[PDB]
Design a protein around this nucleic acid. Structure first.
Ligand SMILES: [Ca+2]
Ligand SMILES: [Ca+2]
Ligand SMILES: [Ca+2]
Ligand SMILES: [Ca+2]
Length: 313
DNA sequence: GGTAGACCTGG
DNA sequence: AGGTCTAC
């Protein structure tokens, strides 16, 4: 049959209690957090989650999930253990109603816009996927990032299943990305200079930093200590490190600063740098702007940012 | 020690 | 969407 819909094969879906006010798929899944989610049917989002493929759709009160067991298994509704993977991914224990309240309390501007854009939360992503996706994000549009990431997974990622005319692949290992002649191969896939960064970082982690554990144990480390460590890797500067911290390493206070931020900082908040004499973006001033919004929104500043970014782009 | 080049490209 | 490395 291939890609399932809620109407098409109703016995195969299981529901996770979640109102649209807590999660809007259409606002989080395509919004440049993950690049590997596709809306194959209208309102149905298919992607790879915990090394299986899932199709997600939502009604007013429920989030509907189905998982694609292969030719190995018979068709089954998602198990409670399987569904806890989905819950974990979307970090539903974090309650947006409460966060939106707190942000709207201490920021009148937020109140105005966040009323229109609810359900904008942050995914908890695998650090590897996240790192390499955002290494490729340098000087890059979401569309081209999406293609680069997709091509990279087809090339070096294990085959999961085929639905319709789409072959879902897992995100590649450090071993695959550290393999010989990978950079050359990735250039043929049009990553450009990012090809060198992918290979160099995969090798840097495996051969110098002590492997996958190093990257994963940056979850337990502080935001300060995790950011310093990521920046050692080739291709990883301040902005990429903040993205990884915020989307993979459980640092909600991380505020990745780009010119989009500055536009928002000036238009909406009328913000000027005080410490640095420089009036434009720099290492000093971006450090301020991150601190400013952490001061303004507090520990979940990064999540609050996402509501504003999802309002514009 | 904050700034102006090169790096890839789809344009 | 447009950041990271290198250079003085
Ligand atoms: Ca994995
Ligand atoms: Ca199953
Ligand atoms: Ca794929
Ligand atoms: Ca670096």
């Amino acid at each position: 049959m291939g890609h399932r819909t809620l109407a098409s094969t109703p016995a195969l879906w299981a529901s996770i209690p979640c109102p649209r006010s807590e999660l809007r798929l259409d606002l989080v899944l395509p919004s440049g957090q993950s690049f590997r989610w596709r809306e194959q049917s209208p309102a149905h989002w298919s992607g790879v989650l915990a090394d299986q493929v899932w199709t997600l759709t939502q009604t007013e009160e429920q989030l509907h999930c189905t998982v694609y067991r292969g030719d190995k298994s018979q068709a089954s509704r998602p198990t409670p253990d399987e569904l806890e993977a989905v819950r974990k991914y979307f970090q539903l224990d974090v309650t947006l109603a409460q966060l939106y309240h707190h942000w709207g309390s201490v920021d009148s501007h937020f109140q105005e816009v966040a009323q229109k854009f609810q359900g904008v939360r942050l995914l908890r992503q695998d650090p590897i996927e996240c790192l390499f996706s955002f290494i490729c994000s340098s000087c890059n549009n979401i569309a081209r990032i999406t293609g680069m990431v997709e091509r990279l997974c087809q090339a070096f990622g294990p085959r999961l299943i085929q639905l319709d005319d789409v072959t879902y692949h897992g995100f590649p290992s450090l071993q695959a990305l550290a393999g010989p002649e990978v950079e050359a191969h990735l250039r043929k896939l049009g990553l450009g200079y990012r090809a060198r960064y992918v290979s160099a970082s995969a090798r840097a982690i495996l051969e110098e930093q002590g492997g996958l554990a190093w990257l994963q144990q940056l979850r337990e480390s502080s935001y300060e200590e995790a950011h310093k460590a990521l920046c050692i890797l080739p291709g990883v500067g301040t902005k990429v490190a903040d993205c990884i911290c915020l989307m993979a390493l459980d640092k909600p206070q991380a505020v990745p600063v780009d010119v989009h931020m500055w536009h928002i900082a000036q238009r909406d908040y009328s913000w000027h740098p005080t410490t640095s004499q420089a009036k434009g973006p720099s290492p000093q001033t971006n450090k301020e702007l991150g601190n400013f919004f952490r001061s303004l929104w507090g520990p979940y500043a990064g999540w609050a940012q996402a509501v504003l970014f999802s309002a514009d782009l």
